[PDB]
Amino acid sequence: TDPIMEKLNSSIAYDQRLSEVDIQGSMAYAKALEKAGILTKTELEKILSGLEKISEEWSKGVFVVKQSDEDINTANERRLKELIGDIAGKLHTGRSRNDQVVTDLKLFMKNSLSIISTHLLQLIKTLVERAAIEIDVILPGYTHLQKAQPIRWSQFLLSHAVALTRDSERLGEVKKRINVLPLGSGALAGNPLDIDREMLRSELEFASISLNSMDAISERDFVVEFLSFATLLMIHLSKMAEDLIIYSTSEFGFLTDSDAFSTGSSLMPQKKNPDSLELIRSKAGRVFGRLASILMVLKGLPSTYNKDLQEDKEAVFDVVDTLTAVLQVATGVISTLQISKENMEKALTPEMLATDLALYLVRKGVPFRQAHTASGKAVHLAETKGITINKLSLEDLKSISPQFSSDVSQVFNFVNSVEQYTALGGTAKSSVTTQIEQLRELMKKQK
Amino acid sequence: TDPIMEKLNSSIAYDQRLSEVDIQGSMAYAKALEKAGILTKTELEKILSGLEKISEEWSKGVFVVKQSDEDINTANERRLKELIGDIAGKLHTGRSRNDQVVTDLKLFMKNSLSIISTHLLQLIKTLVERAAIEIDVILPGYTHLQKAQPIRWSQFLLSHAVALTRDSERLGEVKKRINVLPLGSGALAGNPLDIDREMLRSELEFASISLNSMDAISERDFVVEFLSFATLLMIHLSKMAEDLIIYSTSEFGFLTDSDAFSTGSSLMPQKKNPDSLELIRSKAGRVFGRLASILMVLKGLPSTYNKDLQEDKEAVFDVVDTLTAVLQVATGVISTLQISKENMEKALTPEMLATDLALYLVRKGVPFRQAHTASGKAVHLAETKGITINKLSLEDLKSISPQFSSDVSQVFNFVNSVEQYTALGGTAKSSVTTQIEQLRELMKKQK
Amino acid sequence: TDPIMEKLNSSIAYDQRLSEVDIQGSMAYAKALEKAGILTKTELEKILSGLEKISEEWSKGVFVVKQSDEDINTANERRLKELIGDIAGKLHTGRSRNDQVVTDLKLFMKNSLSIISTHLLQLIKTLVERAAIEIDVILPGYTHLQKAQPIRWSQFLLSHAVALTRDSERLGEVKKRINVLPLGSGALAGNPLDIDREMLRSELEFASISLNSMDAISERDFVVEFLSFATLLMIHLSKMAEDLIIYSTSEFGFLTDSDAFSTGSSLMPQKKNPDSLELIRSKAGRVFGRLASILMVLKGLPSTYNKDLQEDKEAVFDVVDTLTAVLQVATGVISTLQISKENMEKALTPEMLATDLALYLVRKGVPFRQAHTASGKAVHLAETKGITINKLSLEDLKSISPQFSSDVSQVFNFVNSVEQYTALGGTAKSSVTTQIEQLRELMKKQK
Amino acid sequence: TDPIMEKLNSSIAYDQRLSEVDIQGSMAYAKALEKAGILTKTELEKILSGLEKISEEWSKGVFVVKQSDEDINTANERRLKELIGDIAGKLHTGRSRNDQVVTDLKLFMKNSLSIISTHLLQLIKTLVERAAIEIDVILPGYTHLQKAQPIRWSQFLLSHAVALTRDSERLGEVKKRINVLPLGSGALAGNPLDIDREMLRSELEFASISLNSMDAISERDFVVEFLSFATLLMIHLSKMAEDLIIYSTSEFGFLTDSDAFSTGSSLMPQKKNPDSLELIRSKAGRVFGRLASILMVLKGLPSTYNKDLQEDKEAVFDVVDTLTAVLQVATGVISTLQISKENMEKALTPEMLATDLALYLVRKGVPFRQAHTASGKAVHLAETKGITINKLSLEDLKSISPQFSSDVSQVFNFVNSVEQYTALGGTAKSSVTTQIEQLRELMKKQK
């Protein structure tokens, strides 16, 4: 009765989006009640009509929430009575809000997961398709942000795509456990009217039904799981954001964002701020915060139902909206991205080829340890001569090792360098292309 | 290098346990090298023998770790050099610490996850089994920690078993993705020797091979998923600890812990401290802490490899060491716990039957709200007459609603109340029985 | 796409409450600009008046938010221009959204903290008052949720009050660092007009001025601190809620919540669900989540300004709104709960006095180890005799130890038990009153 | 699985570093007992001498830890009996582990905090010192990691030092709440022997004593506060690492790390990996994870003592070790890094002066909007002419606006640019000198 207490319980402010799933759940329940004999065929007909009118009021946006509406379920419950009179009270028989709440969220989630899945797969398709087209671009690979060796721009794009593919895989698993109907669990012990849950299932299109009533109304695993999946996904995008922010600095000059996804200044148009990327990177923390909150909420709570559980809606609503938006922005960034081949090519230094020189020898039967030393020597010689490793003459190389035949010239070529990695997941064109194929088959399975 | 930075880079302190898996990676790799013409049969033979001898030393606990051994991979390399000499230097041809580390971890985790599931299933079995034996026991069902309605003890044990089975499903799922061979990805661009990754897979027993070299070297999703799974599991166990702790208070008296999993007082013979349950409950934060740190370690890191990743080992070893012990202790507690059917039944109050009184009129065709008002008048009446509702005379009842007949007597029985919930997932004995079977099959499919 | 990023970049939906502080910043800035000779006295007067008008609009609730308004700062600029013409543009001279946004949050937070401080002090005051009035109530002291020894209810209430007092102390520390003027830092290099920051500090009533432009613009320590403070505060409240919920069970029966702070049933008049306490408890996770998200948002961010920083607003707004409500509900729960001195005293058992029996011997000159065994023998003997410790006759006591005398009867008195704890901080009445005074001395300093 | 639980309680594996502080608390308690009449002068001197012996055994590393020792407190108790005989048992009179534990950590932390403080102050001193020396170096300031405007290198160093001084400020506050004596609280109701807590306070060197026994036993605020301080400190360091990791890229080339704090390549001499900076950045998550764990462990725990509290030791030990190391490495890096003034100046672009161009007109009396637009035109004219704005002829400027005079030439100077920021906190030399003086005074107050 305390005014502040009423306020703290008012979910009506944010749960209004659960309106349709509420109605969708009420209709199914009304149909099962008819089967239980609780409702006469005519009462059901009248109820389903009332319910269907409520949906229209919601769709049109002409539904009026009264001061007495603490939550969505109530709002729609009130409207039903206001419409079909007192027969609406029968609809309540046997069920509980504890039962409705989880059915509402799962139902909302199934719908939400589908939209998110579509956008995720589209992000992947965008990454693989751009990889295919730009398969000839070669740039430096980084370890500790220091240039290590050449790689194809496509191997870089594919590494992100491959990680995102595991996200779709996890999403599929999460969606499986969310597709379990909890309705018909009552307030704690089950539905007292021996209702037909199978009917409810088929009506709401769930894949199966909850095994235990106590568990069904008190567990929020499906929320934690969705939250974890969302968090790892965001970690993946934060890593992609970091890369593209760094690659788009004047210093690197590897690429440029579209004006639609960046901010500039009339005073110095050259300065293109990566707003899009910074927004995506920040959402990682926001989503993480939601995962951390629900985990702390659930810790140490006894069985069975407790009010603490009401924290779930705001968490899933916020993460669902964040992902739906974030994903679309990411797809936009990647697709309208402007790559600079010249700058990427210019970053490639002959010094990065010292290892390839050692590989050349290793292949000519020279044991690793020995081949590594020969390269170092060549690096030092080139240094003392005032030139670069690729500038060393056959004679200079011979001085170091007689194994250095004239064909060593081919080593000093960045494309030939990249083409050494032909093993399954390397940078050679063959491997890259194989990856594009594998990923395309994955998307077909919808993983 | 700075003395402190060197100490911070050293992992030899805790990674020693990865010795066997290092050797296993080295053996398989040595074989692939020979196949790639990098090693001769005689060189392969000598090396494999050396590797076997190092294993021997670890097993006998006679391996000596010198002060300069930065980590386990290093320790074994030095020892191989000390054993077979210079040809040992050929083993690292084309191999990088970057793809060695992930291979070691995934390998160790594969083995750990098998042991952990063994314990998880033993826990689930235990719960399902006891539930079967004590299916006739009834106790209060709680909502907001207040007695709500009669519930079967078994329906309570099963709510936990059902939650724990979902964990099993998730454990199976993380293992699927941990079972992917990352070896042969080189430092980041792949292996430059056209090495047979497929052969490495077969040797090491992984189910598949990584699609992208950069991803395989930098991703730590497998660590995240495992910690995420572990955290949810702990959330389930801390809830279970909360219940059993409250149920073991002198105020509840529902059960007692065996002396093996508690602590008492000589001065106070009946005071039994539930240490086991509190230790289990406290581990939830410990495990969650590891998840949080790794997500933070990963957030914002750029491609490809970074030293930051080193934080994965300690987080993983800790969680595996925690779950193994906690699951075992949880099993012991559940199995040796003694319940008091007396205190459980004695806790069942007539007030709890008020709802059934309403269910009764509903069955007599009485509209829900009408049936609800009547039970309210009934309880209030009994109140104004200083008596329990079950002691209201038939005439009193009829004075409230004509539909109250002699059969309303059956209503005032806890077993009869419990039986109302025959619907799928309810507390009726038939429903509990079905659940026990369904779970037995679930467990049966553990291979 | 662009429109998606556009909405994702908009904050007007929530930051409208920063309206007044924005107006306040602008007014101070205008005054300093005039002093710097950027504005004419006439121009100043026009701008100030215009700012007052806009302030009125928001106050009356008639401010029209044009769709072009991406945030509050832009909204007010639009309006000012619409009210006084082109001269309003001069107000932007040398200013940036970078130093505007931090001044806005600090000003809002500095205000909000005053309100939270008030509510916090009221909670403590309430706990201390009830502790004084109910200083004679005695109940069991718990350890591992098992009865340990009798304590005074006031000792229980004061343990929560002292903890809350440290939160109150941390609050002042936090408030101290929020009171630092960041305005006049520009985009990052400072303010280029040699503006008078001292004048700005005076106008806005800040305690000091920010030391470094880059830090003032990019630091969010004041947010992390506030959130860290808020989380610990909630941990304490969650512990308090945990106690009251357990104590209000029908099993414990120590107390009952007010009607305004609980939910009952018409069919079950004695079922009082502690809704208020469960809400308070759940707000811990919700507040913690905000801490964790901001900590992650800042982790690894390069200098200086980054769009990631905008996630701060919603974080503090939520936490500020949560604390304000929860503190008010906690105070009401305490002020209006009814305790059961009857039930509390019933819970005290003779067995709890076994330890005092040993103390009695210790004070007689008996070595600790020996006095302990004697009490155990006294306990066992009682057991075998089917009676309680207090029932043992002097004959039985003397056979155990000659040090037992007639005065041993005094031991078996709960009040006499408690009164042993006169050493500072203990449960003796003299200690409880000393605490009451000390906590009141403290609160006088917190104002 | 009893042995499993037993191992779970064996803190002896890590708590050994608490030997001295345990010895210290004991000696203070022994003296207090003697004063209270529990010990005779002779028993007292025997116990004190015995305690000294144990101290030495620990100092000499000769103390034999028998496998029956659960923790350090027990091990020491055992040893005293093995030295002084049954007189040792007198020390237990009225003391509790609950009481010892908190006192042990508080003493350990107090000492550890002094060490952390000095290292923190050293880092701050090094940053402030390098800023004084290198006050003439200028480089670009970044917003969105895009060149914004020229700032002095010293402004960048000071921005980090200032954030670090706040951390120092927080450490002192934490320190104050840790410096409160919890000993004398007993198991939960206080000490029954009327022990002199003031004596204990004096002996143990605490500033004050706990106000309430139940709080002193159950609270862990001092642990969470330390962890929060640690996390923010690490957040500041992770950011500093990020800056220096990027600034040391080949692409930026602003600075080079010492050989002692990096790792290079034999084949690539000019490649130096920022290992130190990556290890530092990675600890932020490690420390954060400990904070999150403890918070999760404390959430919802009932009064008073629970085994869950046992998770604090490892958390504190890990963070104290980590911080101590990280702080020394950070100081090393800053003190020995090589700066490239040439590459820094080379980063300065004429375009960055466009905004100063507008500022120039504002000082002439041209309103902000007009000035910003005129500058924009000059930027566009230059662009269309294929030249930089600093090469725009006076005639050209006069065609954009007659307000441009010959003195506009002074705008095109990066030192003149930096020098406009004379307002407090700005980048002008005078403003940077003032920060140094302000920092110096602060360092005097907190050491």
From Swiss-Prot, chains A, B, C, D:
E.C. code: 4.3.2.1
Pfam families: ASL_C2, Lyase_1
Pathway terms, separated by semicolons: Amino-acid biosynthesis; L-arginine biosynthesis; L-arginine from L-ornithine and carbamoyl phosphate: step 3/3
Assigned keywords, A-Z: Amino-acid biosynthesis, Arginine biosynthesis, Eye lens protein, Lyase
GO biological process: arginine biosynthetic process via ornithine; L-arginine biosynthetic process
Record note on what altering residue 11 to A does: 10% decrease in catalytic efficiency
Expressing tissues: Eye lens.
Positions of the record's site feature: Increases basicity of active site His: 278
PROSITE patterns for this protein: FUMARATE_LYASES
Listed GO MF terms: argininosuccinate lyase activity; structural constituent of eye lens
Effect of residue 275 to N: 99% decrease in catalytic efficiency
Entry-linked InterPro entries: Arg_succ_lyase_C, Argininosuccinate_lyase, Fumarase/histidase_N, Fumarate_lyase_CS, Fumarate_lyase_fam, Fumarate_lyase_N, L-Aspartase-like
Keyword Lyase appears in the UniProt entry: yes
Active-site residue numbers: 144 (proton acceptor), 265 (proton donor)
Catalysed reaction, written as an equation: 2-(N(omega)-L-arginino)succinate = fumarate + L-arginine
GO cellular component: cytosol
Leader sequence segment: none
General remark: Each of the four substrate-binding sites present in the homotetrameric assembly are shared between three of the four subunits.
Described purpose of this protein according to its UniProt entry: Delta crystallin, the principal crystallin in embryonic lens, is found only in birds and reptiles. This protein also functions as an enzymatically active argininosuccinate lyase.
Listed HAMAP family: Arg_succ_lyase
Oligomer and partners: Homotetramer.
Family recorded in the similarity comment: Belongs to the lyase 1 family. Argininosuccinate lyase subfamily.
Designated name of the protein: Argininosuccinate lyase
